[PDB]
Design a protein around this nucleic acid. Structure first.
Ligand SMILES: [K+]
Ligand SMILES: [K+]
Ligand SMILES: [Mg+2]
Ligand SMILES: [Mg+2]
Ligand SMILES: [Mg+2]
Ligand SMILES: [Mg+2]
Ligand SMILES: [Mg+2]
Ligand SMILES: [Mg+2]
Ligand SMILES: [Mg+2]
Ligand SMILES: [Mg+2]
Ligand SMILES: [Mg+2]
Ligand SMILES: [Mg+2]
Ligand SMILES: [Mg+2]
Ligand SMILES: [Mg+2]
Ligand SMILES: [Mg+2]
Ligand SMILES: [Mg+2]
Ligand SMILES: [Mg+2]
Ligand SMILES: [Mg+2]
Ligand SMILES: [Mg+2]
Ligand SMILES: [Mg+2]
Ligand SMILES: [Mg+2]
Ligand SMILES: [Mg+2]
Ligand SMILES: [Mg+2]
Ligand SMILES: [Mg+2]
Ligand SMILES: [Mg+2]
Ligand SMILES: [Mg+2]
Ligand SMILES: [Mg+2]
Ligand SMILES: [Mg+2]
Ligand SMILES: [Mg+2]
Ligand SMILES: [Mg+2]
Ligand SMILES: [Mg+2]
Ligand SMILES: [Mg+2]
Ligand SMILES: [Mg+2]
Ligand SMILES: [Mg+2]
Ligand SMILES: [Mg+2]
Ligand SMILES: [Mg+2]
Ligand SMILES: [Mg+2]
Ligand SMILES: [Mg+2]
Ligand SMILES: [Mg+2]
Ligand SMILES: [Mg+2]
Ligand SMILES: [Mg+2]
Ligand SMILES: [Mg+2]
Ligand SMILES: [Mg+2]
Ligand SMILES: [Mg+2]
Ligand SMILES: [Mg+2]
Ligand SMILES: [Mg+2]
Ligand SMILES: [Mg+2]
Ligand SMILES: [Mg+2]
Ligand SMILES: [Mg+2]
Ligand SMILES: [Mg+2]
Ligand SMILES: [Mg+2]
Ligand SMILES: [Mg+2]
Ligand SMILES: [Mg+2]
Ligand SMILES: [Mg+2]
Ligand SMILES: [Mg+2]
Ligand SMILES: [Mg+2]
Ligand SMILES: [Mg+2]
Ligand SMILES: [Mg+2]
Ligand SMILES: [Mg+2]
Ligand SMILES: [Mg+2]
Ligand SMILES: [Mg+2]
Ligand SMILES: [Mg+2]
Ligand SMILES: [Mg+2]
Ligand SMILES: [Mg+2]
Ligand SMILES: [Mg+2]
Ligand SMILES: [Mg+2]
Ligand SMILES: [Mg+2]
Ligand SMILES: [Mg+2]
Ligand SMILES: [Mg+2]
Ligand SMILES: [Mg+2]
Ligand SMILES: [Mg+2]
Ligand SMILES: [Mg+2]
Ligand SMILES: [Mg+2]
Ligand SMILES: [Mg+2]
Ligand SMILES: [Mg+2]
Ligand SMILES: [Mg+2]
Ligand SMILES: [Mg+2]
Ligand SMILES: [Mg+2]
Ligand SMILES: [Mg+2]
Ligand SMILES: [Mg+2]
Ligand SMILES: [Mg+2]
Ligand SMILES: [Mg+2]
Ligand SMILES: [Mg+2]
Ligand SMILES: [Mg+2]
Ligand SMILES: [Mg+2]
Ligand SMILES: [Mg+2]
Ligand SMILES: [Mg+2]
Ligand SMILES: [Mg+2]
Ligand SMILES: [Mg+2]
Ligand SMILES: [Mg+2]
Ligand SMILES: [Mg+2]
Ligand SMILES: [Mg+2]
Ligand SMILES: [Mg+2]
Ligand SMILES: [Mg+2]
Ligand SMILES: [Mg+2]
Ligand SMILES: [Mg+2]
Ligand SMILES: [Mg+2]
Ligand SMILES: [Mg+2]
Ligand SMILES: [Mg+2]
Ligand SMILES: [Mg+2]
Ligand SMILES: [Mg+2]
Ligand SMILES: [Mg+2]
Ligand SMILES: [Mg+2]
Ligand SMILES: [Mg+2]
Ligand SMILES: [Mg+2]
Ligand SMILES: [Mg+2]
Ligand SMILES: [Mg+2]
Ligand SMILES: [Mg+2]
Ligand SMILES: [Mg+2]
Ligand SMILES: [Mg+2]
Ligand SMILES: [Mg+2]
Ligand SMILES: [Mg+2]
Ligand SMILES: [Mg+2]
Ligand SMILES: [Mg+2]
Ligand SMILES: [Mg+2]
Ligand SMILES: [Mg+2]
Ligand SMILES: [Mg+2]
Ligand SMILES: [Mg+2]
Ligand SMILES: [Mg+2]
Ligand SMILES: [Mg+2]
Ligand SMILES: [Mg+2]
Ligand SMILES: [Mg+2]
Ligand SMILES: [Mg+2]
Ligand SMILES: [Mg+2]
Ligand SMILES: [Mg+2]
Ligand SMILES: [Mg+2]
Ligand SMILES: [Mg+2]
Ligand SMILES: [Mg+2]
Ligand SMILES: [Mg+2]
Ligand SMILES: [Mg+2]
Ligand SMILES: [Mg+2]
Ligand SMILES: [Mg+2]
Ligand SMILES: [Mg+2]
Ligand SMILES: [Mg+2]
Ligand SMILES: [Mg+2]
Ligand SMILES: [Mg+2]
Ligand SMILES: [Mg+2]
Ligand SMILES: [Mg+2]
Ligand SMILES: [Mg+2]
Ligand SMILES: [Mg+2]
Ligand SMILES: [Mg+2]
Ligand SMILES: [Mg+2]
Ligand SMILES: [Mg+2]
Ligand SMILES: [Mg+2]
Ligand SMILES: [Mg+2]
Ligand SMILES: [Mg+2]
Ligand SMILES: [Mg+2]
Ligand SMILES: [Mg+2]
Ligand SMILES: [Mg+2]
Ligand SMILES: [Mg+2]
Ligand SMILES: [Mg+2]
Ligand SMILES: [Mg+2]
Ligand SMILES: [Mg+2]
Ligand SMILES: [Mg+2]
Ligand SMILES: [Mg+2]
Ligand SMILES: [Mg+2]
Ligand SMILES: [Mg+2]
Ligand SMILES: [Mg+2]
Ligand SMILES: [Mg+2]
Ligand SMILES: [Mg+2]
Ligand SMILES: [Mg+2]
Ligand SMILES: [Mg+2]
Ligand SMILES: [Mg+2]
Ligand SMILES: [Mg+2]
Ligand SMILES: [Mg+2]
Ligand SMILES: [Mg+2]
Ligand SMILES: [Mg+2]
Ligand SMILES: [Mg+2]
Ligand SMILES: [Mg+2]
Ligand SMILES: [Mg+2]
Ligand SMILES: [Mg+2]
Ligand SMILES: [Mg+2]
Ligand SMILES: [Mg+2]
Ligand SMILES: [Mg+2]
Ligand SMILES: [Mg+2]
Ligand SMILES: [Mg+2]
Ligand SMILES: [Mg+2]
Ligand SMILES: [Mg+2]
Ligand SMILES: [Mg+2]
Ligand SMILES: [Mg+2]
Ligand SMILES: [Mg+2]
Ligand SMILES: [Mg+2]
Ligand SMILES: [Mg+2]
Ligand SMILES: [Mg+2]
Ligand SMILES: [Mg+2]
Ligand SMILES: [Mg+2]
Ligand SMILES: [Mg+2]
Ligand SMILES: [Mg+2]
Ligand SMILES: [Mg+2]
Ligand SMILES: [Mg+2]
Ligand SMILES: [Mg+2]
Ligand SMILES: [Mg+2]
Ligand SMILES: [Mg+2]
Ligand SMILES: [Mg+2]
Ligand SMILES: [Mg+2]
Ligand SMILES: [Mg+2]
Ligand SMILES: [Mg+2]
Ligand SMILES: [Mg+2]
Ligand SMILES: [Mg+2]
Ligand SMILES: [Mg+2]
Ligand SMILES: [Mg+2]
Ligand SMILES: [Mg+2]
Ligand SMILES: [Mg+2]
Ligand SMILES: [Mg+2]
Ligand SMILES: [Mg+2]
Ligand SMILES: [Mg+2]
Ligand SMILES: [Mg+2]
Ligand SMILES: [Mg+2]
Ligand SMILES: [Mg+2]
Ligand SMILES: [Mg+2]
Ligand SMILES: [Mg+2]
Ligand SMILES: [Mg+2]
Ligand SMILES: [Mg+2]
Ligand SMILES: [Mg+2]
Ligand SMILES: [Mg+2]
Ligand SMILES: [Mg+2]
Ligand SMILES: [Mg+2]
Ligand SMILES: [Mg+2]
Ligand SMILES: [Mg+2]
Ligand SMILES: [Mg+2]
Ligand SMILES: [Mg+2]
Ligand SMILES: [Mg+2]
Ligand SMILES: [Mg+2]
Ligand SMILES: [Mg+2]
Ligand SMILES: [Mg+2]
Ligand SMILES: [Mg+2]
Ligand SMILES: [Mg+2]
Ligand SMILES: [Mg+2]
Ligand SMILES: [Mg+2]
Ligand SMILES: [Mg+2]
Ligand SMILES: [Mg+2]
Ligand SMILES: [Mg+2]
Ligand SMILES: [Mg+2]
Ligand SMILES: [Mg+2]
Ligand SMILES: [Mg+2]
Ligand SMILES: [Mg+2]
Lengths: 92, 271, 45
RNA sequence: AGGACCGAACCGACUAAUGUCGAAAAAUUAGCGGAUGACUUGUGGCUGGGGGUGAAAGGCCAAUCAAACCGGGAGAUAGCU
RNA sequence: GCUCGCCGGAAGACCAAGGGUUCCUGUCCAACGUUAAUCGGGGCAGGGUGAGUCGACCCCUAAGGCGAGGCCGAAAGGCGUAGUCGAUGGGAAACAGGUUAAUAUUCCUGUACUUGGUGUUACUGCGAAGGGGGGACGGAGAAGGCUAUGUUGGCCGGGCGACGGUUGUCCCGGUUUAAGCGUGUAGGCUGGUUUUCCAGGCAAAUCCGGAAAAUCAAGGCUGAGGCGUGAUGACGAGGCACUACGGUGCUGAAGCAACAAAUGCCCUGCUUCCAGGAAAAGCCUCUAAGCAUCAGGUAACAUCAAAUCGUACCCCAAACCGACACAGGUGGUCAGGUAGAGAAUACCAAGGCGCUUGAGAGAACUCGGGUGAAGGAACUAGGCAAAAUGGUGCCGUAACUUCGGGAGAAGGCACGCUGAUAUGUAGGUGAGGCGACUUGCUCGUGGAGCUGAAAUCAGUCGAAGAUACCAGCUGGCUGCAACUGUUUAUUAAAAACACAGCACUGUGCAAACACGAAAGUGGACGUAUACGGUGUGACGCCUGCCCGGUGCCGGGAGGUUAAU
């Protein structure tokens, strides 16, 4: 089911307080996914690469902040995060 | 019928209503009415071509049958209805086989009366016939100018054509204008007079009553400035100009008839 | 006390947008001008 | 029932004072007119320059209107300063 | 932190539009902030937007846009058919409480629900580009039942009071609970079948329509709310355990009744009127072309599936539109208390703020106010401006009138508090109780509380009782315009425009006329009781004479007369 491409979906694990509090208490992992990357694709990718039982994936698009420095305006890239909830068989 | 209204408010002082008690007090028959959007006078190019029209009450089109073909089938008049699209009232005719259709309500017609249409039939008010079968010197309405068409002449409240003569293939008709027009004998005409003749005695009574009939205010040329209308300007109520339209053509006695394709059919012009 | 610019992004795009300009012979020439001049914002979009 | 009455919202703009390098390129304050109607307002459409639209004032058409705005003819022409 | 102040139909709380990170945290004070700044919507980093149900998307369409062929146009292009787009409208489903420094109908917990796909069983006559039904529609009005909500008891937990009194009718605070799934009610709408049948619904149809003949006193439909249950659940005044002084896990009392009550809801109802009130899919239904151990439907079940984009924040504002952190402008929603007719006004609750230069002084003069001797419009172009009047009930009210008006004409008088009539009444809502009908969310029947005017009679305080805020000045003669309305955005609101009504006049429908090289639209899916133009301007009494001039209409002999 969508071999080779699944590898390109997950970019990195996200590091924050809200990310951390959702590790132990909610049993989820927050992670930066590709701008495409549907909830099925993120789930199927976590199911293979991280190899854990996924309950459900929630997803959102974060808007890049307009950082004006020196004398030029420049906006960051829009990146998509995914809160991935895990089943009781969990680890990382 | 013509009831004058009591003067409890100014603009309710001069009101004179045409109350018809025999009309219907309920919603109309849905299958024979489609929607009818308003132009506001404007056309394809979105430009006011006819002035003084705009607004008024939203009003749906009744699919009224003027041609009145469906032959040899007697039809009972179920109920007389209001038509907002029209001067004359309409009648919901139930054909014996189980159609319903709207027709213009003639003078002597009521909820219960039976009507037939076609070639044979009987000579009675409501019954459509070819004008060849109709007697000379008889009052008709809803008259066709061409055989097979709907019905052009005499459809306004109280209106009727009288058949003057019959020269072979042609029938000479005396119209309500006074014009004596020659039409084809194969053309059809519904017998009698068009109902709601009290319509003319209605008097509105307020500016508002014209607005909710979809009319907008007419501004007089004399009021305007030279740039707008030929009558225009002057330092306090001047004129000194021969009456004219906003486009310079003379009004007030000036024949604009110039068809020339139908001049053969007109026997005597109106007067 | 109510000024002239009363914004609406639908109206904006329907009136002045890229497809609104592309639609017409003269609207295509506007774009041809802005390209010829070399503008960054070709339309409002 | 009513282009009925009184009166808030809402729509307006009759009087006065203030303000006039303003708080504001038209407002504030205190009064004032309409307030179920020819009412009012949101959203979207249509009508284009000698053209539109106008319950008509030459009013309105992006703070611009007895002919909009932008680019072009164009360095119009000026017996004038 | 504690006082003080101001808003509270907002200066509160949610949204749309529009902004576009302003949100939140740490940090910094050059500039930006009309002052300072440790602060900030400022600089600099880092966080923060979680959806099958909310919105968009999608499904249908309105005005309207585009528009294969097409028709038309020097070219450009115009119009328009089939179509296809186009919301501001129609179309499946989620609620309570808990949680983050910042999202929550999205996370969590607890209960639900919808539409699809896909397998098994038991049945069985299914299927559109078609038919029919439905969706599905106006203004006003009036009532009845409800609820949101509020008030007061009841119960529960505290409280006995900085200066006189306060264990009592005393004081404070709480008294909350959803969608769903049941029950089908207050009510609203209707005839319900059975078989036959027929030129209609362009074909077909058992459906719709029409016509029959019988058959029983009604059977459906719709429907707020209440009761249920969800809920031994959550929440809950507080405590207990503890403090980075933040709290946090644990426990967690009562958790009822009455009465009042919407502009909400029943109600897309009902009566009622004339100006006569979208469309199309979803949805149910019916069959043609088709297809017959097929394919489809149907239920009951199991299982998957519900993608994508928006979700922070401000939003009558310092974040939008106004060049400004601008005394402006900006759509919807929510609507607590006392007084009140009230969304007016006053004071307040929840919640929110004190308007980003202060500090002194207390001149003239200016601005916004208050009071004013005697006088009282003498002011001035003009009573401009201020002063006045102002509520409710009852009495009383002129000319003139179109018989409605004028009219709130004018002018009067009565109002507070406290007892009594009645230890709070006319009423209002009416509990347990008594019988009875069928089977109930019953009827009468009685009234327990509860709520509650308005009078009258007597007392009684003040200068004054509509005591504040709130809230008509009145009358007389008269010009113009009948009237409500409209108008010079920003020096003119008027006697100007419009207006109903009136007349003239054109127009026989391929109408006149209008926009347009044209095609074509509008007029009008109208047809002379209609339409366009022009003048006049309700209504009443009237509207006199002139056709030489100019126009127009008709007439056609003669004269004159182009192209050819
Ligand atoms: K030149
Ligand atoms: K306080
Ligand atoms: Mg989830
Ligand atoms: Mg999402
Ligand atoms: Mg970038
Ligand atoms: Mg067009
Ligand atoms: Mg059109
Ligand atoms: Mg056009
Ligand atoms: Mg007209
Ligand atoms: Mg209009
Ligand atoms: Mg019509
Ligand atoms: Mg009409
Ligand atoms: Mg008509
Ligand atoms: Mg022949
Ligand atoms: Mg006219
Ligand atoms: Mg007129
Ligand atoms: Mg005129
Ligand atoms: Mg003028
Ligand atoms: Mg013009
Ligand atoms: Mg002229
Ligand atoms: Mg003049
Ligand atoms: Mg004169
Ligand atoms: Mg003269
Ligand atoms: Mg002339
Ligand atoms: Mg001329
Ligand atoms: Mg002329
Ligand atoms: Mg004549
Ligand atoms: Mg536009
Ligand atoms: Mg060119
Ligand atoms: Mg350019
Ligand atoms: Mg741009
Ligand atoms: Mg009315
Ligand atoms: Mg009124
Ligand atoms: Mg009055
Ligand atoms: Mg008044
Ligand atoms: Mg407003
Ligand atoms: Mg004003
Ligand atoms: Mg104004
Ligand atoms: Mg004055
Ligand atoms: Mg003043
Ligand atoms: Mg000055
Ligand atoms: Mg100043
Ligand atoms: Mg004011
Ligand atoms: Mg006043
Ligand atoms: Mg007033
Ligand atoms: Mg008035
Ligand atoms: Mg407006
Ligand atoms: Mg608009
Ligand atoms: Mg347009
Ligand atoms: Mg021009
Ligand atoms: Mg030009
Ligand atoms: Mg032109
Ligand atoms: Mg023109
Ligand atoms: Mg106007
Ligand atoms: Mg002038
Ligand atoms: Mg202007
Ligand atoms: Mg001007
Ligand atoms: Mg010019
Ligand atoms: Mg010019
Ligand atoms: Mg312009
Ligand atoms: Mg040159
Ligand atoms: Mg020059
Ligand atoms: Mg206040
Ligand atoms: Mg209040
Ligand atoms: Mg909201
Ligand atoms: Mg901005
Ligand atoms: Mg953005
Ligand atoms: Mg920033
Ligand atoms: Mg902040
Ligand atoms: Mg610092
Ligand atoms: Mg410093
Ligand atoms: Mg620096
Ligand atoms: Mg500073
Ligand atoms: Mg400054
Ligand atoms: Mg900070
Ligand atoms: Mg900041
Ligand atoms: Mg979704
Ligand atoms: Mg909902
Ligand atoms: Mg949209
Ligand atoms: Mg999709
Ligand atoms: Mg579809
Ligand atoms: Mg569509
Ligand atoms: Mg259309
Ligand atoms: Mg279309
Ligand atoms: Mg087109
Ligand atoms: Mg082809
Ligand atoms: Mg072709
Ligand atoms: Mg073509
Ligand atoms: Mg043709
Ligand atoms: Mg075109
Ligand atoms: Mg079409
Ligand atoms: Mg919408
Ligand atoms: Mg829906
Ligand atoms: Mg919707
Ligand atoms: Mg829903
Ligand atoms: Mg909640
Ligand atoms: Mg909980
Ligand atoms: Mg808890
Ligand atoms: Mg927040
Ligand atoms: Mg759950
Ligand atoms: Mg469970
Ligand atoms: Mg359960
Ligand atoms: Mg269940
Ligand atoms: Mg449901
Ligand atoms: Mg289901
Ligand atoms: Mg259908
Ligand atoms: Mg609707
Ligand atoms: Mg209605
Ligand atoms: Mg009324
Ligand atoms: Mg009544
Ligand atoms: Mg009621
Ligand atoms: Mg309740
Ligand atoms: Mg509640
Ligand atoms: Mg109590
Ligand atoms: Mg104690
Ligand atoms: Mg004490
Ligand atoms: Mg003591
Ligand atoms: Mg004691
Ligand atoms: Mg208490
Ligand atoms: Mg209490
Ligand atoms: Mg239910
Ligand atoms: Mg169920
Ligand atoms: Mg149900
Ligand atoms: Mg039942
Ligand atoms: Mg048939
Ligand atoms: Mg049948
Ligand atoms: Mg039933
Ligand atoms: Mg049912
Ligand atoms: Mg229920
Ligand atoms: Mg109840
Ligand atoms: Mg209960
Ligand atoms: Mg309940
Ligand atoms: Mg229970
Ligand atoms: Mg239980
Ligand atoms: Mg608990
Ligand atoms: Mg605390
Ligand atoms: Mg009650
Ligand atoms: Mg209330
Ligand atoms: Mg209905
Ligand atoms: Mg269904
Ligand atoms: Mg079925
Ligand atoms: Mg799953
Ligand atoms: Mg799923
Ligand atoms: Mg939010
Ligand atoms: Mg806020
Ligand atoms: Mg705020
Ligand atoms: Mg707000
Ligand atoms: Mg404001
Ligand atoms: Mg606010
Ligand atoms: Mg400005
Ligand atoms: Mg600004
Ligand atoms: Mg400020
Ligand atoms: Mg502001
Ligand atoms: Mg304001
Ligand atoms: Mg009072
Ligand atoms: Mg207030
Ligand atoms: Mg300040
Ligand atoms: Mg001083
Ligand atoms: Mg002073
Ligand atoms: Mg003053
Ligand atoms: Mg002073
Ligand atoms: Mg005073
Ligand atoms: Mg004074
Ligand atoms: Mg004095
Ligand atoms: Mg004194
Ligand atoms: Mg005195
Ligand atoms: Mg005096
Ligand atoms: Mg004097
Ligand atoms: Mg003097
Ligand atoms: Mg004088
Ligand atoms: Mg004077
Ligand atoms: Mg005076
Ligand atoms: Mg005055
Ligand atoms: Mg004074
Ligand atoms: Mg005084
Ligand atoms: Mg005063
Ligand atoms: Mg006085
Ligand atoms: Mg006084
Ligand atoms: Mg007084
Ligand atoms: Mg009085
Ligand atoms: Mg008198
Ligand atoms: Mg008089
Ligand atoms: Mg009085
Ligand atoms: Mg009276
Ligand atoms: Mg007194
Ligand atoms: Mg008393
Ligand atoms: Mg008693
Ligand atoms: Mg006693
Ligand atoms: Mg007593
Ligand atoms: Mg009592
Ligand atoms: Mg008493
Ligand atoms: Mg009692
Ligand atoms: Mg008693
Ligand atoms: Mg009694
Ligand atoms: Mg009683
Ligand atoms: Mg009752
Ligand atoms: Mg009962
Ligand atoms: Mg008793
Ligand atoms: Mg009393
Ligand atoms: Mg006494
Ligand atoms: Mg006394
Ligand atoms: Mg006394
Ligand atoms: Mg008073
Ligand atoms: Mg007044
Ligand atoms: Mg008088
Ligand atoms: Mg005079
Ligand atoms: Mg007037
Ligand atoms: Mg007059
Ligand atoms: Mg206007
Ligand atoms: Mg206006
Ligand atoms: Mg105005
Ligand atoms: Mg002005
Ligand atoms: Mg304007
Ligand atoms: Mg101007
Ligand atoms: Mg003015
Ligand atoms: Mg003025
Ligand atoms: Mg005025
Ligand atoms: Mg005047
Ligand atoms: Mg006028
Ligand atoms: Mg006459
Ligand atoms: Mg006449
Ligand atoms: Mg032409
Ligand atoms: Mg033509
Ligand atoms: Mg039409
Ligand atoms: Mg006049
Ligand atoms: Mg007389
Ligand atoms: Mg005369
Ligand atoms: Mg003559
Ligand atoms: Mg003569
Ligand atoms: Mg002449
Ligand atoms: Mg002539
Ligand atoms: Mg002649
Ligand atoms: Mg001749
Ligand atoms: Mg001759
Ligand atoms: Mg000759
Ligand atoms: Mg010759």
């Amino acid at each position: 089911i969508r071999e080779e491409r699944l590898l390109k979906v997950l970019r990195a694990p996200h590091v924050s307080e809200k990310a951390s509090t959702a590790m132990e208490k909610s049993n989820t992992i927050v992670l930066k996914v590709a701008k495409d990357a549907t909830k099925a694709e993120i789930k199927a990718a976590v199911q293979k690469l991280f190899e854990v039982e996924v309950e459900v994936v929630n997803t959102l698009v974060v808007k890049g902040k307009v950082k004006r420095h020196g004398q030029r305006i420049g906006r960051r890239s829009d990146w998509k995060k995914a809160y991935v909830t895990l089943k009781e068989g969990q680890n990382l | 019928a013509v009831v004058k209204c009591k003067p409890t408010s100014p603009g309710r002082r001069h009101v004179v209503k045409v109350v018809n008690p025999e009309l219907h007090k309920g919603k109309p028959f849905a299958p024979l009415l489609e929607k009818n959007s308003k132009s506001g006078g404007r056309n394809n190019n979105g430009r006011i071509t006819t002035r003084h029209i705009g607004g008024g009450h939203k009003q749906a089109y009744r699919i009224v049958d003027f041609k009145r073909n469906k032959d040899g089938i007697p039809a009972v008049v179920e109920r007389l209805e209001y038509d907002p699209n029209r001067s004359a009232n309409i009648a919901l005719v139930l054909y014996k086989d189980g159609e319903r259709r709207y027709i213009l309500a003639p003078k002597g017609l009521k909820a219960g009366d039976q009507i037939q249409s076609g070639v044979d039939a009987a000579i009675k008010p409501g019954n459509t016939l070819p004008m060849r079968n109709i007697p000379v010197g008889s009052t008709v309405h809803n008259v066709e100018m061409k055989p097979g068409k709907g019905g052009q002449l005499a459809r306004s409240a109280g209106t009727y054509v009288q058949i003057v003569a019959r020269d072979g293939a042609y029938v000479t008709l005396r119209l309500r204008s006074g014009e004596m027009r020659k039409v084809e004998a194969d053309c059809r005409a519904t017998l009698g007079e068009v109902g709601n003749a009290e319509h003319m005695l209605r008097v509105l009574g307020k500016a508002g009553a014209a607005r909710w009939r979809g009319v907008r205010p007419t501004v007089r040329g004399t009021a305007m400035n030279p740039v707008d209308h030929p009558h225009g300007g002057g330092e306090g109520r001047n004129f000194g100009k021969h009456p004219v339209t906003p486009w310079g053509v003379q009004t007030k006695g000036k024949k604009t008839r110039s068809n020339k394709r139908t001049d053969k059919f007109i026997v005597r012009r109106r007067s | 006390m109510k000024r002239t610019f009363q914004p609406s992004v639908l109206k904006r795009n329907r009136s002045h947008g890229f497809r609104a300009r592309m639609a017409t012979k003269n609207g295509r020439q506007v774009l041809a001008r802005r390209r010829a001049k070399g503008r960054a914002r070709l339309t409002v979009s």
